């Protein structure tokens, strides 16, 4: 069916079809403690053009290019869930493992804040069954787990040709991430902001699907 | 799914070359979503290195004159009786009021820093707040 | 017309300056029947045990006073390319409110 594919490629011409500009503000990101970072000794190598400056051995993440890379990441995850996509919150962290799993259940998504075994998304032919639809999008809110080591899900995602939209801070490896964005992910009031912005993206992707279902159903 | 060589480079070019070849007769949807809105940097694989020799980190710091003013204030007096409230974005503590008085007195036109300092001290003492300093 | 430098120039973390002997107020968000995790602000939070006096007074949502030491407090080792992070502040408690 050509009409089924033409209606999906129509919002791709728009630079901002979902209008993801009013979801945040230049002043709201400051009150949520986003520009904060770790010390100067724990700073990773691939983290120099993403830092504005230091404040007594405390790097300050610049919000200029942060908001630029954030809207390009939210728009990428919007078109994925719009075309019947599958997301997965992989963030092994023992502090907010309850809020992440509930936001995916209320919106009908998928989460994974538990221990990662071995042959999950890689060896899916002898574990979950014969043919299993692997998630085409993995959201990494916390890349580093509880051992300070890059997780294996971001390494296996690029193996099976699967993108990954992660939230890199200042001690991660933002190389295999196709849409990185420098931002803090250790503050209590900060992680509640990114978890809510991802929830509002679902309310404008899968809930907005009904606006285009009535256009094709007029013929039959 | 396709090529399992993540150490070569980004996935976009590999998927493009795999589809252009002829073994994978299916256009991925995430590929279309990616080429519809390209980011700013291809996710290439770069092996991290270790700095040696004269190679340093070209990351400048952030300093102002208010830092020196607050340092001198803490060296002369110390901590104030008011507690810092980090929950309020526009919380004016004792140090903020002190540096504001200092800069609004400097905007006039004087060259001696000790005179400005003692004038700001007398002004804040005669205003209302009494900084219980040490002996 | 608001840029980026003016946002953190007047920020409280830049107004306090050094984090050495500073009176800061905090709140309580989680109690493990032994510790009082005080969230004064910033990136990390402070930790402290139950004092012998006013044990039942300190509950979830109690405004207390802290001395405010190092926010992250990290230190490198002998044969370590990087230093570890404890995600703790550890500030000395003063009084109530």
């Amino acid at each position: 069916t050509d009409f089924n594919d033409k209606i999906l490629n129509e919002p791709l011409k728009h630079s901002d079809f979902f209008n993801v500009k009013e979801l945040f503000s230049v002043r709201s990101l400051f009150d949520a403690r986003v520009h904060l970072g770790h010390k100067a000794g724990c700073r990773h190598r691939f983290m120099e053009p993403y830092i504005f400056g230091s404040r007594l051995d405390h790097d300050i993440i610049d919000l200029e290019q942060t908001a630029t890379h954030l809207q390009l990441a939210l728009n990428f995850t919007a078109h994925m869930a719009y075309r019947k996509g599958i997301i997965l919150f992989i963030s092994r962290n023992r502090q907010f493992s309850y809020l992440i799993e509930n936001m995916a259940r209320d919106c009908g998504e998928y989460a994974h804040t538990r221990y990662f075994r071995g042959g999950m998304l890689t060896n899916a032919r002898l574990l979950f069954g014969p043919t299993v639809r692997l998630p085409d999008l993995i959201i990494f809110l916390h890349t580093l787990n509880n051992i300070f080591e890059p997780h294996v899900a971001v390494r296996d995602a690029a193996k099976m040709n699967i993108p990954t939209v992660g939230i890199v801070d200042t001690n991660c490896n933002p190389c295999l991430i196709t849409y990185p964005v420098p931002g803090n992910d250790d503050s209590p009031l900060a992680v509640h902001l990114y978890c809510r912005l991802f929830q509002t993206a679902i309310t404008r992707a899968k809930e907005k699907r009904q606006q285009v279902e009535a256009l094709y159903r007029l013929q039959g | 799914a396709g090529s399992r060589l993540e150490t070569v480079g980004s996935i976009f070019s590999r998927t493009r070359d795999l589809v252009r070849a002829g073994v994978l007769k299916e256009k991925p949807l995430w590929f279309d979503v990616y080429d519809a809105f390209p980011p700013l940097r291809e996710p290439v694989f770069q092996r991290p290195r270790v700095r040696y020799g004269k190679a340093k980190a070209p990351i400048q710091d952030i300093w102002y004159h208010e830092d020196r003013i607050r340092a001198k204030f803490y060296s002369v007096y110390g901590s104030g009786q008011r507690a810092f409230d980090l929950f309020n974005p526009n919380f004016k503590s004792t140090c903020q009021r002190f540096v504001e008085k200092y800069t609004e007195l400097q905007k006039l036109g004087e060259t001696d820093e000790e005179k400005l300092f003692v004038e700001t001290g007398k002004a804040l003492l005669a205003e209302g707040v009494i900084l219980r300093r040490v002996g | 017309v608001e840029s980026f430098a003016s946002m953190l120039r007047h920020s409280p973390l830049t107004q306090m300056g050094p984090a050495k002997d500073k009176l800061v107020i905090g709140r309580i968000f989680h109690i493990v029947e032994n510790d009082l995790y005080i969230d004064f602000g910033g990136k990390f939070h402070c930790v402290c045990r139950r004092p012998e006096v006013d044990g039942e007074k300190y509950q979830k949502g109690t405004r207390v006073r802290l001395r405010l030491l190092d926010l992250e407090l990290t230190s490198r080792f002998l044969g370590a390319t990087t230093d570890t992070t404890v995600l703790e502040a550890n500030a000395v408690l003063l009084g109530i409110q």
Partner: peptide, 25 residues
């Protein structure tokens, strides 16, 4: 506009502790 960070002498530095007999002979 004029709020750019300036790399100066880096304040918040207390005088380093000396020896107990450095000032004497």
């Amino acid at each position: 506009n004029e709020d750019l960070p300036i790399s100066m002498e880096n304040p918040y530095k207390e005088p380093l502790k000396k020896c107990i007999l450095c000032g004497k002979h």
